[PDB]
Amino acid sequence: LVVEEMLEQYPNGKIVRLLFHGEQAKLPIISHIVQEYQVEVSIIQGNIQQTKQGAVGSLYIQLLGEEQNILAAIEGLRKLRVETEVIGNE
Amino acid sequence: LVVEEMLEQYPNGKIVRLLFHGEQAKLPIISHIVQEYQVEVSIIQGNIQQTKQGAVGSLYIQLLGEEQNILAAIEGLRKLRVETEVIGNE
Ligand SMILES: [Zn+2]
Ligand SMILES: [Zn+2]
Ligand SMILES: [Zn+2]
Ligand SMILES: [Zn+2]
Ligand SMILES: [Zn+2]
Predict the structure, then answer these.
(1) Preceding omega of B2 cis (within 30 degrees of 0)
(2) How many CB pairs under 8 A join A and B?
(3) Nearest residue to B52 (alpha-carbon basis) of B20, B22, B18, B26
(4) Which residues span the domain enclosing B44?
């Protein structure tokens, strides 16, 4: 992997993996969540490609902010059809 | 797997996988979160064994309740040293 290297380098907040299969909400996802949930975003690693289905791939991001807001932003992503999970829970 | 079969049979709330490596908080975890976060718990699948390290294994549970409370219960588990993630995000 090794996802714990991301946790090691980016300790604060939560690190999440976002998946894009082309079904995600057609809006500016990252700015949308920044503004709505008052979270900061740092891109750690990613691979996204444009396909006929739309943007497809993965993004690992660090979210910073109040705990409740980070949690809400993560469920927000999921509801916007971006599968999201906090790394380090396997 | 197939974790989506759990989502199919238990549609409401969130389905989470909890991991126990023996480092988890030494308290009655499931009742603790039920009471603190006002969530309901249904066990879907699990394999837990007692070892010299303590209780080790996994539990898949359905959490029911208000969205914010479910989210808080999930982070609560993590803080209590039970690695937890919402299934269906791979
Ligand atoms: Zn997707
Ligand atoms: Zn929104
Ligand atoms: Zn996982
Ligand atoms: Zn553990
Ligand atoms: Zn507690």
Answers:
(1) yes
(2) 37
(3) B22
(4) 1-90
Q: How far is B58 from chain A (nearest CA, A)?
A: 10
Name the closest residue on chain B to residue A71, using Cα atoms.
Answer: B71
In order, the DSSP letters of B15-44 are EEEEEEES-S-SS-HHHHHHHHHT-EEEEE
The experimental technique used to determine this model is X-ray
Nearest residue to B61 via CA among B20, B30, B15: B15
Q: Tell me which chain B residues have a C-beta less than 8 angstroms from the C-beta of A68.
A: 68, 71-72
- Comparing CB atoms, the residue among A67, A72, A85 nearest residue B85 is A85
* B64, B39 contact by CB (below 8 A): yes
A71 token code pair:
């949690």
Which CATH number do you get for residue B72?
Answer: 3.30.70.260
Please indicate if any CB of chain B lies within 8 Å of the CB of A10. no
- For B8-30, b where at least 16 C-beta lie within 10 A, e where not — what string? eebeebbbbbbbbeeebeeeebe
Q: How many domains does chain B have?
A: 1
